[PDB]
Short mmCIF file of C-alpha atoms (C1' of nucleotides) in Angstrom, two decimals:
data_model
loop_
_atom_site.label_atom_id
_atom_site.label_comp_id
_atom_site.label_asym_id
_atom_site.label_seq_id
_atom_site.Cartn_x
_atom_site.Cartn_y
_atom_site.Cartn_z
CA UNK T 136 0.00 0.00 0.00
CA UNK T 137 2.98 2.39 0.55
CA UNK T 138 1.32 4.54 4.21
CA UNK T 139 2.18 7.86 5.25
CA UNK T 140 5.11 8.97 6.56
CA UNK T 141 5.02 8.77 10.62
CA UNK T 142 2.68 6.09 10.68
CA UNK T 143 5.63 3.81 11.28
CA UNK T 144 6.10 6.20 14.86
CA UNK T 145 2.43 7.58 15.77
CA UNK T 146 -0.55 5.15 15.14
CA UNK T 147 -3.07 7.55 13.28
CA UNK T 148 -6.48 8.27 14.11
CA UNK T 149 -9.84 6.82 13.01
CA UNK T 150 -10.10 9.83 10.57
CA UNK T 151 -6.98 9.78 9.35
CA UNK T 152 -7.10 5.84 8.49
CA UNK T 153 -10.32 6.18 6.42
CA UNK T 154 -8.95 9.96 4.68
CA UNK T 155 -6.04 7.52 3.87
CA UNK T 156 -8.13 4.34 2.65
CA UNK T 157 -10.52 7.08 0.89
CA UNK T 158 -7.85 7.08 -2.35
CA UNK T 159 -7.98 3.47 -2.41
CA UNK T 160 -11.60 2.10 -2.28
CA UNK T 161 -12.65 0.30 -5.68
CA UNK T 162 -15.23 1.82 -7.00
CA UNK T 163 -17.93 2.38 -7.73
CA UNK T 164 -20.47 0.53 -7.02
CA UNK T 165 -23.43 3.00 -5.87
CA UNK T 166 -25.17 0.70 -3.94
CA UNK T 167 -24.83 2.31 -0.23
CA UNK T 168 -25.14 -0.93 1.33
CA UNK T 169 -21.89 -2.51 -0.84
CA UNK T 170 -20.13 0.54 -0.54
CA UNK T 171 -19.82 0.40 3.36
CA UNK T 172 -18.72 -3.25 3.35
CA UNK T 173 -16.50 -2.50 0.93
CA UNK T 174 -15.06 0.54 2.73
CA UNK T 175 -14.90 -1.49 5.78
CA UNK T 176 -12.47 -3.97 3.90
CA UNK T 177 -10.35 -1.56 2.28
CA UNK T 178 -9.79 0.15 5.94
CA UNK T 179 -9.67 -3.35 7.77
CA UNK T 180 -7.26 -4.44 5.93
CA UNK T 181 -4.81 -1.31 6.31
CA UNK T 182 -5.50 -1.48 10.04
CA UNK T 183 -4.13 -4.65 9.95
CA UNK T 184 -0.76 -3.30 8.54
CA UNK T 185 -0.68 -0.40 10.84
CA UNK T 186 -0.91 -2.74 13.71
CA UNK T 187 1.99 -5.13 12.35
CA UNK T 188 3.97 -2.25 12.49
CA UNK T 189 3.73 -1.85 16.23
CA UNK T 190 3.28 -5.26 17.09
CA UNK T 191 4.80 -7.81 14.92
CA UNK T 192 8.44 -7.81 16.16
CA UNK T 193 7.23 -7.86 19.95
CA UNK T 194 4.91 -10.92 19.45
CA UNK T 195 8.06 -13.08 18.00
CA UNK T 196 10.42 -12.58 21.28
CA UNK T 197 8.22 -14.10 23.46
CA UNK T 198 6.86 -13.44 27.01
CA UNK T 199 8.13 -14.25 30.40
CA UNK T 200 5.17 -14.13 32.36
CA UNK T 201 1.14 -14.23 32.05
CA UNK T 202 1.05 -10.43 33.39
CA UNK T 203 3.25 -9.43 30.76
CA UNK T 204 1.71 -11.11 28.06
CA UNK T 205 -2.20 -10.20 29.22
CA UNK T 206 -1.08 -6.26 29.25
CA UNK T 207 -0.75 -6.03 25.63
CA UNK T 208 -3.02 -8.81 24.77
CA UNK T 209 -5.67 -6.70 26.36
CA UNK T 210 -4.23 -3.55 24.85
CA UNK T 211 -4.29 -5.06 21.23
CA UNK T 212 -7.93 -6.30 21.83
CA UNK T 213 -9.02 -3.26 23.29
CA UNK T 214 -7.11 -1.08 20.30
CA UNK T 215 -9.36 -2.80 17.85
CA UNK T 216 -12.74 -2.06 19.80
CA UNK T 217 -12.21 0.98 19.96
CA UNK T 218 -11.38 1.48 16.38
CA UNK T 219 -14.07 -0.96 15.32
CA UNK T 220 -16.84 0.89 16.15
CA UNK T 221 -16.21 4.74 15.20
CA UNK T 222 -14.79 3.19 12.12
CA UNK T 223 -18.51 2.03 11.48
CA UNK T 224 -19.79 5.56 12.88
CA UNK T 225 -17.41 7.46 10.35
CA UNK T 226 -18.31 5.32 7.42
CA UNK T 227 -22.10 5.91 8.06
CA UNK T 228 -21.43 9.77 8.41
CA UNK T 229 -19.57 10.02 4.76
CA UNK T 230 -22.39 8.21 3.39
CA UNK T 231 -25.23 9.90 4.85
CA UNK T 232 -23.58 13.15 2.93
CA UNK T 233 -22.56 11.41 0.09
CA UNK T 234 -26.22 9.91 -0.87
CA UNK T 235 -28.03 13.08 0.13
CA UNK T 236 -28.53 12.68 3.47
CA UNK T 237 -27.48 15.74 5.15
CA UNK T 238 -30.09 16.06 7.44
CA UNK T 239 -28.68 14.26 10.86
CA UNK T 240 -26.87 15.46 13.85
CA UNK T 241 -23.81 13.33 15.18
CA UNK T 242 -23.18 14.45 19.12
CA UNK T 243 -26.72 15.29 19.37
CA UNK T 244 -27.99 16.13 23.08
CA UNK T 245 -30.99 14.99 23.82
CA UNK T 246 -32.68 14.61 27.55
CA UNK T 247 -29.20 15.69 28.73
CA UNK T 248 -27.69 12.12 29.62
CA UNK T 249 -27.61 9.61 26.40
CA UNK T 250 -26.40 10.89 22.79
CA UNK T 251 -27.09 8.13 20.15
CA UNK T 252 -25.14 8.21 17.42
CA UNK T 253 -27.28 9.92 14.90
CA UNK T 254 -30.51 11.69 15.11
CA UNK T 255 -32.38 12.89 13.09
CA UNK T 256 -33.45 15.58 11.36
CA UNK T 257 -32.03 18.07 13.47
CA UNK T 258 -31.31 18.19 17.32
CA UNK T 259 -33.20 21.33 16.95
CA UNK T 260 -36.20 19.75 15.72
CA UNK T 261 -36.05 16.94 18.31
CA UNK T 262 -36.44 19.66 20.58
CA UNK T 263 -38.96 21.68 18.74
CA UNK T 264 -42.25 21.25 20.57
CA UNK T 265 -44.55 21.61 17.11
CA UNK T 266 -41.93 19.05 15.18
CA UNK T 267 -44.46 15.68 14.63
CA UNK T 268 -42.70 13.56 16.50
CA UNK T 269 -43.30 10.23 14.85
CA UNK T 270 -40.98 12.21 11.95
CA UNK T 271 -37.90 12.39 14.21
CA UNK T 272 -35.54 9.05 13.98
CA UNK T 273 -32.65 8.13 15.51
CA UNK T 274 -29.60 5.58 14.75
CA UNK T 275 -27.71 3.74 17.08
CA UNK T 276 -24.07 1.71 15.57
CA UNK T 277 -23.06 -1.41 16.75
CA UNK T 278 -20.97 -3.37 14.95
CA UNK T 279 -22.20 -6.66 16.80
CA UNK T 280 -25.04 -6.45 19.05
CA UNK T 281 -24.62 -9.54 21.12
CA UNK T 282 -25.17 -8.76 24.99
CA UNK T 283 -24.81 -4.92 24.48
CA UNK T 284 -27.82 -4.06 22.07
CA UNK T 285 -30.19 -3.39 25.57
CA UNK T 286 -27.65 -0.10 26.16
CA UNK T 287 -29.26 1.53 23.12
CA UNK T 288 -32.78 1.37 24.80
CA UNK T 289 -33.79 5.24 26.34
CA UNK T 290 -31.12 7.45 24.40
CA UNK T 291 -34.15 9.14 23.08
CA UNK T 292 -37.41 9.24 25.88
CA UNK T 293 -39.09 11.17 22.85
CA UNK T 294 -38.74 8.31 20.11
CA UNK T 295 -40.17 4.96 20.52
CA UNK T 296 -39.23 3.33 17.50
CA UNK T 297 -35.80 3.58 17.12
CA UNK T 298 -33.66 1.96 14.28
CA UNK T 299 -30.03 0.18 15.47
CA UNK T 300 -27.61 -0.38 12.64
CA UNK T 301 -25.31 -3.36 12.88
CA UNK T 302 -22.74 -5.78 11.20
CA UNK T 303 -23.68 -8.74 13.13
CA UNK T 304 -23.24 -12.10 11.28
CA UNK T 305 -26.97 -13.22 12.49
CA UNK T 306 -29.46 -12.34 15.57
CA UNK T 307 -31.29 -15.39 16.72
CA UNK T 308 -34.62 -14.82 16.50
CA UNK T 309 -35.24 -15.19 20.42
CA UNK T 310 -33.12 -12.05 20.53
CA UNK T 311 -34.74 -10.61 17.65
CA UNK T 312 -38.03 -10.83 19.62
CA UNK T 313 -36.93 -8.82 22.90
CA UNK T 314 -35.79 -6.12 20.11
CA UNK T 315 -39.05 -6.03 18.55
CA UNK T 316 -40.81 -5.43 21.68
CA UNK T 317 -38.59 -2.68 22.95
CA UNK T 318 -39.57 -0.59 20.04
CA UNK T 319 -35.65 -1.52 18.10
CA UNK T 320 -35.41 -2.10 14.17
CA UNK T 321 -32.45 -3.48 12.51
CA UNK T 322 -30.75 -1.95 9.64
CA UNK T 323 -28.40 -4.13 8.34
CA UNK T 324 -26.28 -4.29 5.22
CA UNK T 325 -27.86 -6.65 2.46
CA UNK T 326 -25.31 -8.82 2.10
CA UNK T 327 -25.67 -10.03 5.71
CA UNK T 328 -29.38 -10.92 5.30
CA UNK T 329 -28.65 -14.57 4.78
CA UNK T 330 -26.89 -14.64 8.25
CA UNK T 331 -30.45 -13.86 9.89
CA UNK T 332 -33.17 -16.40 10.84
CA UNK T 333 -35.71 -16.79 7.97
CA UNK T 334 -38.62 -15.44 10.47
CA UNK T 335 -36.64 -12.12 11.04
CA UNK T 336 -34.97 -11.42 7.22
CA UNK T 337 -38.56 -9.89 6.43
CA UNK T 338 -38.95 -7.48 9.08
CA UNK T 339 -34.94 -5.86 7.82
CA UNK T 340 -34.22 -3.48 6.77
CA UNK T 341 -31.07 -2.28 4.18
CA UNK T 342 -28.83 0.71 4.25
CA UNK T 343 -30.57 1.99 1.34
CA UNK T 344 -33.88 1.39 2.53
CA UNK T 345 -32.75 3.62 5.28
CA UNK T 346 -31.32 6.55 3.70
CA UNK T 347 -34.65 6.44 1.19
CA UNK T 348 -37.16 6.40 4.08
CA UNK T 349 -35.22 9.69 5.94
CA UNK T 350 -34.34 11.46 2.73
CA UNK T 351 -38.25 11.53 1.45
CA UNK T 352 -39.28 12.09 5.33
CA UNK T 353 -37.26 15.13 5.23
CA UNK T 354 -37.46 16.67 1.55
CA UNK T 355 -39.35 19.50 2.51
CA UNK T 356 -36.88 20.59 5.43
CA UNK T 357 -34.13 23.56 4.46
CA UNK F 155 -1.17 -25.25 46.96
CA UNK F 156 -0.93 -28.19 45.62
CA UNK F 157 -4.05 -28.51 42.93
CA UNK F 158 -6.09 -31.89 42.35
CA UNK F 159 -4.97 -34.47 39.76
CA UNK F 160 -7.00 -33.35 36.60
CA UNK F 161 -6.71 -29.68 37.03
CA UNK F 162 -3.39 -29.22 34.94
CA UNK F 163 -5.51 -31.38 32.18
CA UNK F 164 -8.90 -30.49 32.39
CA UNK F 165 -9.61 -26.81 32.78
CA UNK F 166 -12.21 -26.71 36.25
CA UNK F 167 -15.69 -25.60 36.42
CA UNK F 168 -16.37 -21.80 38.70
CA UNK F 169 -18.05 -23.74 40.98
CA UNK F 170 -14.81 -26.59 41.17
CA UNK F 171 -12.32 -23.79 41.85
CA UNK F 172 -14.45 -22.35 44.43
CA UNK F 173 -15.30 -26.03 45.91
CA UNK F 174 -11.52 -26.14 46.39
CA UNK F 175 -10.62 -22.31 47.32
CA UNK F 176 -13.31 -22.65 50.45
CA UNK F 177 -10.83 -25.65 52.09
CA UNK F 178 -8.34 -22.62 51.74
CA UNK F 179 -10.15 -19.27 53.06
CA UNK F 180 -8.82 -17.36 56.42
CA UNK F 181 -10.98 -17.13 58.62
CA UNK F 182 -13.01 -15.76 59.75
CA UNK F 183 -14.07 -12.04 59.53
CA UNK F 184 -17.70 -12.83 59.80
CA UNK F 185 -18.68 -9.43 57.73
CA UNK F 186 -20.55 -10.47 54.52
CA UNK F 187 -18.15 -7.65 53.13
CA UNK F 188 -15.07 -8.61 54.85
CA UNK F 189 -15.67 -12.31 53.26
CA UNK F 190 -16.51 -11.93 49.74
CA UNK F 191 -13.60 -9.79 48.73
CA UNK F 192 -11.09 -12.16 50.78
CA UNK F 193 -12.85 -15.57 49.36
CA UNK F 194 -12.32 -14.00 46.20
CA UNK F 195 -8.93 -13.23 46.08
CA UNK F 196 -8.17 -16.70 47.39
CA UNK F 197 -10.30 -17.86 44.19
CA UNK F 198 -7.94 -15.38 41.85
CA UNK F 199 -5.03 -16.67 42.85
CA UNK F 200 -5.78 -20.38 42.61
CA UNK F 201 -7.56 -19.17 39.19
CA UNK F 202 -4.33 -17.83 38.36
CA UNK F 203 -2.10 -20.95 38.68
CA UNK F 204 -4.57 -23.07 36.86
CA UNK F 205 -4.33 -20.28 34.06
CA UNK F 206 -0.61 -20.39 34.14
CA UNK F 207 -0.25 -24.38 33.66
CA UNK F 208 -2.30 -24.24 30.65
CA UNK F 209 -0.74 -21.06 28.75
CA UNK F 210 3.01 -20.54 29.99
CA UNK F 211 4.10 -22.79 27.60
CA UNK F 212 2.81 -20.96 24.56
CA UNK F 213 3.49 -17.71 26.26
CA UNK F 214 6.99 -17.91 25.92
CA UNK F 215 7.73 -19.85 22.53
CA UNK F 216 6.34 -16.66 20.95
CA UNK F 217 3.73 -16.33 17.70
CA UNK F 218 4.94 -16.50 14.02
CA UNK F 219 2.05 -13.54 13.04
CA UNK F 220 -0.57 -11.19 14.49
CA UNK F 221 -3.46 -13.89 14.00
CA UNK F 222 -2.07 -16.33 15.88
CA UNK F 223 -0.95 -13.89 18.62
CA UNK F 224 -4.54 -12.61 18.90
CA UNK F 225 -5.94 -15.91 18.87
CA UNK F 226 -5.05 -16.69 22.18
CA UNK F 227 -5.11 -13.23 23.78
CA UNK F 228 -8.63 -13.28 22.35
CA UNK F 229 -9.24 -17.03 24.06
CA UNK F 230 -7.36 -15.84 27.60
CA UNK F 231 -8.87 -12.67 28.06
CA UNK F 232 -12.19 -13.89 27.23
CA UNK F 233 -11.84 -16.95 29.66
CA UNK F 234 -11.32 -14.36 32.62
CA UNK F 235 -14.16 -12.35 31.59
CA UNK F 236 -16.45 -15.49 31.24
CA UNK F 237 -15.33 -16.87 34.79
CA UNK F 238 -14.94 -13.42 37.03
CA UNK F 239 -18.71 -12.93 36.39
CA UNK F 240 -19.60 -16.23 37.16
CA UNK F 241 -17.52 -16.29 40.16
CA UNK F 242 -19.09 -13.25 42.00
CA UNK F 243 -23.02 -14.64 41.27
CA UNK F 244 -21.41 -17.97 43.16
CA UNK F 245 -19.88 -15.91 45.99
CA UNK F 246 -23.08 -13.99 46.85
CA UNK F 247 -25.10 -17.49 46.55
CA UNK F 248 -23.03 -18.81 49.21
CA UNK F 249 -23.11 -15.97 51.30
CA UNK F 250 -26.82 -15.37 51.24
CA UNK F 251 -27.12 -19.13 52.47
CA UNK F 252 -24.58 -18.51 55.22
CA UNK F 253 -26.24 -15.60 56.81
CA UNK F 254 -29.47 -16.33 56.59
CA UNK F 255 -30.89 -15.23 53.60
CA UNK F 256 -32.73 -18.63 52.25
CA UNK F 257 -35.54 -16.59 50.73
CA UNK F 258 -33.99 -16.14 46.76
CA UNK F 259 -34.04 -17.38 43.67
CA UNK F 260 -31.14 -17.85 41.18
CA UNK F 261 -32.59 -18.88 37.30
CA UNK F 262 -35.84 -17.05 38.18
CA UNK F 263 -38.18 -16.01 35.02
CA UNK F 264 -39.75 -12.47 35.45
CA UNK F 265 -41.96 -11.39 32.09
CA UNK F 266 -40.67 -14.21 30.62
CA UNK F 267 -37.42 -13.13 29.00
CA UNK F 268 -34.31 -11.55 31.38
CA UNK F 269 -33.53 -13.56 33.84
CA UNK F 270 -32.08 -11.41 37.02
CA UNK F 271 -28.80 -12.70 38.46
CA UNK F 272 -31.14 -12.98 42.12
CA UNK F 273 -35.02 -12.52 42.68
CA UNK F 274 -36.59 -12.17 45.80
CA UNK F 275 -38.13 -13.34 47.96
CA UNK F 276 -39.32 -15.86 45.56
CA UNK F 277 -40.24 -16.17 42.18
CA UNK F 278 -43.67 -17.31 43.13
CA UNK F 279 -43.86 -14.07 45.00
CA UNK F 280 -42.96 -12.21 42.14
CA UNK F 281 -46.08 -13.59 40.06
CA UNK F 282 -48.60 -13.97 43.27
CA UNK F 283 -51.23 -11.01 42.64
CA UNK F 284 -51.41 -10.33 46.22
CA UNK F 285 -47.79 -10.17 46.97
CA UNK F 286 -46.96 -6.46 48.03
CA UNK F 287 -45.04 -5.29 45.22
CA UNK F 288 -42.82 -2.78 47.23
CA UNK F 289 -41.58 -5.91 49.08
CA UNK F 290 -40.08 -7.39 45.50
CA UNK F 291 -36.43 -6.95 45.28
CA UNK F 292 -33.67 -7.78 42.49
CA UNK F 293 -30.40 -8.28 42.48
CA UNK F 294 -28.37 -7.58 39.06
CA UNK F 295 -24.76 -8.46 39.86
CA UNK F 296 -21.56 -6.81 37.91
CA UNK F 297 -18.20 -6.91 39.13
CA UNK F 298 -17.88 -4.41 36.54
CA UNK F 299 -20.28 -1.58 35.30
CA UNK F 300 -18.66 0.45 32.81
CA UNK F 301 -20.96 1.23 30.21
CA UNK F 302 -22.84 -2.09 30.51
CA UNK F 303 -24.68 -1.29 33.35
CA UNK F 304 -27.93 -0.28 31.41
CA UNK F 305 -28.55 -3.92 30.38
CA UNK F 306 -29.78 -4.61 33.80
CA UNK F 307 -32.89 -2.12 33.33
CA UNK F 308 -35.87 -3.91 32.38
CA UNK F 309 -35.25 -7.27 33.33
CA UNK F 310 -37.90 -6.95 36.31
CA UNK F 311 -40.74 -4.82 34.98
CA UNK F 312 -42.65 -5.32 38.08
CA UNK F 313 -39.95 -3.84 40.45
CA UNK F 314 -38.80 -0.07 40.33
CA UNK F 315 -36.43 -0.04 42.25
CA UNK F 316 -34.24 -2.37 41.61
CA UNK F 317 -30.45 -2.96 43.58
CA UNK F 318 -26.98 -3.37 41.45
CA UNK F 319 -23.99 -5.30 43.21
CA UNK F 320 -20.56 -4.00 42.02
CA UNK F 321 -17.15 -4.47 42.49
CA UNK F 322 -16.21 -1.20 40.54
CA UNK F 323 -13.06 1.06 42.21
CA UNK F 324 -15.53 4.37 42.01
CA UNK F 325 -18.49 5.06 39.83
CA UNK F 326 -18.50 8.27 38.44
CA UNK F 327 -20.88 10.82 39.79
CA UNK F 328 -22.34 11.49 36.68
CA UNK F 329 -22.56 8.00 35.77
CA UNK F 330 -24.03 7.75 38.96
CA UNK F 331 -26.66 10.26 38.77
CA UNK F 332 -27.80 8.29 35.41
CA UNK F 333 -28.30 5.33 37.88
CA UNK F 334 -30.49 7.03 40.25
CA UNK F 335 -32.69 8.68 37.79
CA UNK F 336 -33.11 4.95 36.18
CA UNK F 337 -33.95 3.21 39.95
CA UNK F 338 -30.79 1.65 40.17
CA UNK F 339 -29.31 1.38 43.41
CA UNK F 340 -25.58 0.36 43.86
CA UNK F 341 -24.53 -2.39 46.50
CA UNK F 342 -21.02 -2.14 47.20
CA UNK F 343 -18.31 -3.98 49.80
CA UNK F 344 -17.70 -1.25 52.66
CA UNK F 345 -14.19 -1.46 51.95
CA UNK F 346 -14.38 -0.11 48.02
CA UNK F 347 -16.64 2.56 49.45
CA UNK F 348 -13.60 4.90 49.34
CA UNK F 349 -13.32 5.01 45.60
CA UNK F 350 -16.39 6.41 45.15
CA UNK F 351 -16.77 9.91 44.95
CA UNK F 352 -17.82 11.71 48.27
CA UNK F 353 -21.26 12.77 46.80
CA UNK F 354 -22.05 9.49 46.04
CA UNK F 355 -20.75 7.33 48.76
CA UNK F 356 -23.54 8.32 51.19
CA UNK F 357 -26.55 6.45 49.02
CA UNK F 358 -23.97 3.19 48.80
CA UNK F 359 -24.92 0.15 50.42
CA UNK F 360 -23.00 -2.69 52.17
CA UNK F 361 -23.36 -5.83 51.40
CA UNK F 362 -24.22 -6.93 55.17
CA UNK F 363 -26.85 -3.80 55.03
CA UNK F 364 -28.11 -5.70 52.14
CA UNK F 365 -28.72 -8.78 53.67
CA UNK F 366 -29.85 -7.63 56.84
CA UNK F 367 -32.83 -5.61 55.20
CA UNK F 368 -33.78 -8.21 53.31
CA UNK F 369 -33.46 -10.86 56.01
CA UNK F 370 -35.82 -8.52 58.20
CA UNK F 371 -38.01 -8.27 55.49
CA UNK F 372 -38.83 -11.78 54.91
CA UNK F 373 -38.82 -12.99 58.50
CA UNK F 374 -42.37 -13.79 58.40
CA UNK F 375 -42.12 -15.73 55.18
CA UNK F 376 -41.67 -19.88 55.63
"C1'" DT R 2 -26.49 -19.26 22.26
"C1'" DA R 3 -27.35 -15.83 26.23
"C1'" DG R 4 -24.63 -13.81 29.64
"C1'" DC R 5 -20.31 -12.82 31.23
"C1'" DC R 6 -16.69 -8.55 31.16
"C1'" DT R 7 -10.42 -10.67 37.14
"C1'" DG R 8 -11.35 -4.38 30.71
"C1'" DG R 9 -7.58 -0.81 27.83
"C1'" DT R 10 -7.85 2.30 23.92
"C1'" DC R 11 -9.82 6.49 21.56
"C1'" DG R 12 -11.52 11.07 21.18
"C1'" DA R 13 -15.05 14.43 23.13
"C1'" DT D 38 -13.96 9.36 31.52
"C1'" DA D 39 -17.96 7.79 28.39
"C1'" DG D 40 -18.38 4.88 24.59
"C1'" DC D 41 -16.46 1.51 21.91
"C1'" DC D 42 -16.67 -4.06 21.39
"C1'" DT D 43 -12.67 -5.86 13.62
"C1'" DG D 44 -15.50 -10.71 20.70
"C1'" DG D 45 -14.33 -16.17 22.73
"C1'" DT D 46 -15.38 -18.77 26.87
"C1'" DC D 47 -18.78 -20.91 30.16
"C1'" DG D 48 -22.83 -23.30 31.54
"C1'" DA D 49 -28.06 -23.31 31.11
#
DNA sequence: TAGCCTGGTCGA
DNA sequence: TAGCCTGGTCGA
């Protein structure tokens, strides 16, 4: 790939990464829901470089003891969660603008506490009194669900049915079930459908699905 | 210590370390408080032995790539995680047995999907119509909160206030406001107490307290 | 396969 | 220090 100069020396940011992986994505393919996977690979795979960098030539020499091994084990894990998941954010923001979607607000307040990840239209209008509130949405990331989906719940007291976005090879359908009845809706990338129990592949919904609903919803707003 | 025979072949159950650990405690600091966080340091460090047997070997003989490397870290650090959680929900069983507190259940089904960590004082009570509600309580138990701590909400619709056991070194105060507002109430060992900012500290609860209003409370229960 | 998190990194 | 979980192990 050939990276940037003091890569080698200061691991770059989540930004950076993608504003780096940007010149190298394949294109085109317009779909929104083939471009994120996509843009997820092309940045995935750089990570991985990045990281070999940094970690490669202390994983060959070995470790004397548990407590030294564990401390960078859990660093190295904890590296890639973090990254993970405002990779996913970042990649949903550029294509938000990029298919006409530029009605959303990313470090929205809204009862003070919680900020989900995206809201939308406006955190004005989520907060104007005479906005019809079964018009406002809002978009929770996770790029697997698994135990943690039930933190999502009351980020917005104001919007019942809220949508959750994720990457997740498969929900079982038991699980699916306690997400219906909290008011949650799955986006997920089309490609991933097949991963899903055949009960809950009708009731999900695609990235471009998403973007259509929201950008209609909000035609007539400024 | 000397471990049994099978140990340094076949990785033990939580409840087989802690079979073994008790044979080892101090004795005898008859504080619920006192108790837990010793019986659970004797646990960790026959936990850590065990863990040692089984992955010193590899440790040191290094990894040829990142994959392999991350293999294992992955597989180590999610064994801990599995078994600390395990290991606290067993320590608080015991102890509730020990001082008194027979009146709990352990796999007990609420609404008919999350299942608290403890119930009480039964979950017969829980569904009998004429069972004052206010006299309900739940137990979620996390040794730590973090941002997980919201997946405990719901899982007992029918009780409000509802009691968190931690083993967290300080909850923030913000953090801890969110808590309050939600009905969550912390129970904490005295001794951790400390950590905790001063604002928050006053509405913490002991384990012993724990116990002892709950043991008063279902006095006149067979 | 639901729940665990003997948890550090990243970027407001 | 709040949110992340490029997540596998354990035991119903």
């Amino acid at each position: 790939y050939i990276l940037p100069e003091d890569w080698h020396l200061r691991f770059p940011s989540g930004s950076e990464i993608i504003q780096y992986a940007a010149s190298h994505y394949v294109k085109n393919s317009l779909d929104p829901d083939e471009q994120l996977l996509d843009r997820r690979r092309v940045e995935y795979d750089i990570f991985l470089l990045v990281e070999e960098l940094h970690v490669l030539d202390i994983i060959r020499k070995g470790f004397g003891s548990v407590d030294e091994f564990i401390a960078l084990a859990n660093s190295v894990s904890n590296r890639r969660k973090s990254r993970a998941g405002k990779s996913l954010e970042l990649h949903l923001e550029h294509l938000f603008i990029e298919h006409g979607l530029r009605h959303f607000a990313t470090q929205a307040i809204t009862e003070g506490n919680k900020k989900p990840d995206f809201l939308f239209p406006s955190a004005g209008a989520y907060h104007d009194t005479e906005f019809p509130v079964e018009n406002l949405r809002m978009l929770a990331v996770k790029t697997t669900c698994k135990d943690r989906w039930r933190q999502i719940l009351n980020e917005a007291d104001k919007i019942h049915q809220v949508h959750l976005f994720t990457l997740q090879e498969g929900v079982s359908l038991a699980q699916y079930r306690e997400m219906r009845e909290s008011g949650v809706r799955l986006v997920v990338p089309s490609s991933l459908h097949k991963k899903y129990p055949e009960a809950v592949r009708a009731e999900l919904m695609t990235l471009g699905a998403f973007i259509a609903e929201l950008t209609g919803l909000y035609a007539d707003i400024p």
